[PDB]
Amino acid sequence: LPPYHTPLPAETLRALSIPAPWTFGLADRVRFGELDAIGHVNHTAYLRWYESFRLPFLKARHVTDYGPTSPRLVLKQVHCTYLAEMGMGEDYVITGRVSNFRTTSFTMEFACWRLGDAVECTSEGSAVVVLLNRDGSGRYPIPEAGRASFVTEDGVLAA
Amino acid sequence: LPPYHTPLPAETLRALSIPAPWTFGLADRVRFGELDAIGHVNHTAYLRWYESFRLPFLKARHVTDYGPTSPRLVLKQVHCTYLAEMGMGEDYVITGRVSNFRTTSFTMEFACWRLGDAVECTSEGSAVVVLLNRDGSGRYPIPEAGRASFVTEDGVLAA
Amino acid sequence: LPPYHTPLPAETLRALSIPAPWTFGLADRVRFGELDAIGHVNHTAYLRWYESFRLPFLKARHVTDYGPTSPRLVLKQVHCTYLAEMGMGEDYVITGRVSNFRTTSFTMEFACWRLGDAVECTSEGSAVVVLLNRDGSGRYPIPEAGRASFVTEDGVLAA
Amino acid sequence: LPPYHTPLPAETLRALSIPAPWTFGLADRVRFGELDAIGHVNHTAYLRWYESFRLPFLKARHVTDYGPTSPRLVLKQVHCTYLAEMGMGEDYVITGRVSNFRTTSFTMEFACWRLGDAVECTSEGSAVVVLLNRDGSGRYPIPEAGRASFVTEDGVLAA
């Protein structure tokens, strides 16, 4: 088992049988409160896990520092698929990347890997995020160091 | 069935077989997302219902209008009891009242009444709330109209 | 304002300026607990609203009675778009339909209509749902009365 | 920082400056989804943390192994106090102990310790739990090993 709440690099992921293109994971465990009326992880927990991943990822990628001159990040769309049902206390790793970016918005892809006796993808997801100016003047361009990290870490070509 | 999300006065409560001392009720219905892994409303949903109740109630009692000037409401303590399990789709009424008050703080009591062939109290609870000046500078006295409404409407004797 | 938690037919929807193809709505109000750290309805609340809609809709459409010989309904995928941000206490109507069906699965589309000074669509959504046999023997065909309701109420051609 | 989601014994607690009487801790980190509309951990998240804690704790104390045979755990009451606000990403340790017990029921006490430059108790709480036979037929006596563990590990004098 890896440490929880700790960025996992590609090396650690491969050791856990989590394949490319994933380079950044975070591990957590299922909580009782995420279980629905028949004892499965509810469909929105997965989306919450992906949203939790985004916060530190987007700081590590130099998109935002969440401070006063940072862009406000706004979700435009999400999608989530449910490949295998999960239950109480299961350990998992969330992987997320940037798959595509534009001037003032970008797309991420996500997966949830259960660490059982087998490593198994239980869910995939995506999100489209827009950057807005906190002063209401409109869209805010992704910082240049963010564009650079997306290229050098996520391997997204700028073209 | 009374209307939902609408203050229900004492006479409406008595018609629903909800007794004294309750004079202010709000009706809603159990959601699927509130159910725990065995099909019962989870223990925190009750406390959320009591919280929801407090917002319109404290405006009705003249404590706050929730404007930019108004006091900050700070929760210091809650208790909740679980008298009967509730499942999917049950209608209920939340009742609440102020039971004590001093200068800048007060205690409320709550109950949950399941509507149905017979009306049944499924839970009781309490909260202690304090009032602070929004600008950080001190404690905020319960408005005079609040103190009076607590005495006349909630039947509290004095402080 | 319409009544809450009460199926709204096409007539009522049109009166609220909610256009075709919508024929079935349910009204509710935003709760404090659905608000995220900056005071907007969080992205998963919308998905919970759509899931809440499904439960009674699928019974009204004769897909399931949620009993022992009913299919188990399993979500395969969802998508949600966020068109306008929402805040505390806003009244809304959720509309949902079946847009397409197959033998053992179907697709629904959803929208959230805010009832403010203007009626405004704040979000759209979709879901793909599969029917499984509660005894584990695999997929379960959508009942014939369900197929019929989809055609006659949602206006989905079986072709 | 200790490991997360792992029972932390008394010696680990003292090294984190968490005092007697606590001997059993579990660490986690605040999530974005736990934050209320002003950026603070919402009052119910604490109670959820205490609940999460109880599950491994009651297995460690020999009350239940959560098998098909094991007792049903029923919550009758909780209290929670709010001593200091918590924001995004704070690490914490939950401590819990049994404080009293009788024949088929017991009372637990809990605290939340924010980890940081200095360790600070942000909340205290309590729960009353009863044990029922899973087959519906009666009340379930606290196993003898449970009673003994409560006396020796949690320092309870008798019943």
Domains of chain A: residue spans and CATH: 7-154 (3.10.129.10)
User: What number of other Cβ atoms are within 10 A of residue C119's Cβ?
Assistant: 14
d(CA C157, CA D15): 68
Q: Tell which residue, B41, B32, B29, B46, has the closest CA to residue B80.
A: B46
B84 touches chain C (CB under 8 A): no
d(CA B150, CA B103): 12
What are B102's two structure tokens? Answer: 């001093």
Q: Which residues of D touch A4 (CB under 8 A)?
A: 3-5
Q: Which chains have 3 or more CB–CB distances shorter than 8 Å to chain C? A: A, B, D
Strands (E), chain A: 25-29, 72-82, 91-101, 105-115, 119-132
Residue B7: helix, strand or coil by DSSP?
A: coil
CA distances from B13 to A4, A117, B94 (A): 50, 56, 10
Q: How was this structure determined?
A: X-ray
How many Å lie between the alpha carbon of A155 and the closest alpha carbon of chain C?
Answer: 26
Contact B33 C55 (CB under 8 A): no
B47 touches chain A (CB under 8 A): no
The amino acid occupying position A11 is E
How many Å lie between the alpha carbon of C159 and the closest alpha carbon of chain B?
Answer: 33
Which residue on chain B is closest to D45 by alpha carbon?
B44
Residue C3: helix, strand or coil by DSSP?
A: coil
The amino acid occupying position A154 is D
- Give, as one character, the DSSP assignment of residue C89: T
How many Å lie between the alpha carbon of D88 and the closest alpha carbon of chain C?
Answer: 9
Residues in chain D followed by a break, C to N above 2.5 angstroms: none
Residue of A76, A80, A85 lying closest to C81 (CB–CB): A76
Residue B122: helix, strand or coil by DSSP?
A: strand
A51 touches chain D (CB under 8 A): yes
What are B68's two structure tokens? Answer: 């930019």
d(CA C2, CA D2): 53
Q: Which residues of D touch B51 (CB under 8 A)?
A: 43
D73 touches chain B (CB under 8 A): no
Inter-axis angle of helices C43-60 and A43-60, to 10 degrees? 160
Q: Which chains have 3 or more CB–CB distances shorter than 8 Å to chain D? A: A, B, C
d(CA D105, CA D128): 7
D75 touches chain B (CB under 8 A): yes
Residue with tokens 């010696």, as numbered in its chain:
D11
C138 touches chain B (CB under 8 A): no
Q: Tell which residue, D91, D98, D109, D102, has the closest CA to residue D27.
A: D91
d(CA B48, CA B159): 27
Contact D36 C38 (CB under 8 A): no
Q: Work out the widest C-alpha separation in chain B, in whole angstroms.
A: 52
Residue B58: helix, strand or coil by DSSP?
A: helix
d(CA C156, CA A149): 47
Residue of C32, C37, C39 lying closest to D32 (CB–CB): C37
What are A63's two structure tokens? Answer: 């998109």
What are D2's two structure tokens? Answer: 């200790």
Residue of B4, B31, B88 lying closest to C4 (CB–CB): B4
Q: Tell which residue, A79, A89, A3, has the closest CA to residue A39.
A: A89
The amino acid occupying position C145 is A
CA distances from B8 to A146, B93, B96, B107, B156 (A): 54, 9, 11, 21, 20
Contact B80 D78 (CB under 8 A): yes
Reported resolution, Å: 2.0
d(CA B2, CA A24): 52
Q: Tell which residue, D112, D116, D114, has the closest CA to residue D47.
A: D112
- Which residues lie across from C111 on neighbouring strands? C95, C124
3-state secondary structure chain D: CCCCCCCEEHHHHHHCCCCCCCCEEEEEECCHHHECCCCCECHHHHHHHHHHHHHHHHHHCCCCCCCCCCCEEEEEEEEEEECCCCCCCCEEEEEEEEEEECCCEEEEEEEEEECCCCCEEEEEEEEEEEEECCCCCCECCCCHHHHHHHHHCCCCCCC
